[PDB]
Assembly symmetry: D2
Homo-oligomer: 120 residues x 4
């Protein structure tokens, strides 16, 4: 069974650390992004999410509340286990920026991908 607990890195070099997954599938953790709109401001930021519990290759989602900007990212994906037991998270994300008013909403959401593997 793939659990999100542990430390992961992604293809951009970001690191996240996920704590214990509870019996509902909820987890917390931290996220250190390698990149940002203003990378001189980056600080470690909290995440909160839910994975499925029964599945060996669960889907999941989490939210990162950036501690250094007004933005928020959500990630969703699936944990896959290889025939050799190696785990990969395949994800996609939406990065929501804060805009001044509803007339600017159209420009507020970026999209992308990230592949994660275990640090150790």
């Amino acid at each position: 069974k793939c659990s999100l607990t542990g430390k992961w890195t992604n293809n951009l070099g970001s690191i996240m650390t996920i704590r214990a997954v509870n019996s509902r599938g909820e987890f917390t953790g931290t996220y250190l992004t390698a990149v940002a709109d203003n990378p001189g401001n980056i600080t470690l930021s909290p995440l909160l999410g839910i994975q499925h519990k029964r599945a060996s290759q669960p889907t999941f989602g989490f939210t990162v509340h950036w501690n250094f900007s007004e933005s928020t990212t959500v990630f969703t994906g699936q944990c896959f286990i290889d025939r050799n037991g190696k785990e990969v998270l395949k994800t996609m994300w939406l990065l929501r920026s804060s805009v001044n008013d509803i007339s600017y909403d159209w420009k507020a959401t970026r999209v992308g991908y990230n592949n994660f593997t275990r640090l150790s």
Copy 2:
């Protein structure tokens, strides 16, 4: 100040309730989707997320762990307040399906929008 705690409906007819937002911006709630891949299976599903606390029109994200499928959705957006104090959540979402192995990952993520308004 635009608040997330309370009862919301979206443009598809789905409803959600969001409980008290704590000092870290974290919240839980319950989501009733009006639509699904298999709508005869729909059950109430928990959500867990984080909003920004200081901002009057905060960005936020949350995860919905569907209790009736192997899928997961994440929503991100911003809470706007107009001149008369009417709130709207402008959101975008990613809906992740479970696929059998990594070679099917390409097809696993749907995207869309939802505009939420306060029930009553």
Copy 3:
């Protein structure tokens, strides 16, 4: 049968004209966005796309080459007709910005929706 040829407006106030659709489903047209990163620079921009021909409610895609920035948008969606013969294009888009090198690629793609109705 839902036709794309003609003049459309979307929920942001943008307008487009689409010319005759050929036997292969290919079409050209002109797009006037109501919004931009630098709205003082907006000029009319060409579009080029393909729809399905046989379907009464065809899917389609088109590219807009912005004539006033280095960005490009793609739209995809479906043309629906209701009981009274009213057409709507339900679309989603990706807006690609130019970045300096591949290390900035992660931030280069915005996503959103647009609903179009026929002008007159």
Copy 4:
């Protein structure tokens, strides 16, 4: 200057062939996807798009009209040139399925990425 003319493969193994880019940046080509909802049906399919012309690392978009389904995909991205002259297309895509009526629109759009490099 990166021109999209030539043959490319992506990370899923798909192949596309792009013909001459005209002075407006328009191009046609063909796309042989490695994967599909029903891979037993895959046939070579046409594409039509636009790239920017002046830029050495242009943004672009194109539409693929699948010749074996009612779906359409759009891709947008940028062509990057390395310090060694090697070219990569970084893209993201929206895959629009045909649904029966507007009430199913919410489930009709998949999203993903693709990285392309030159065949030869």
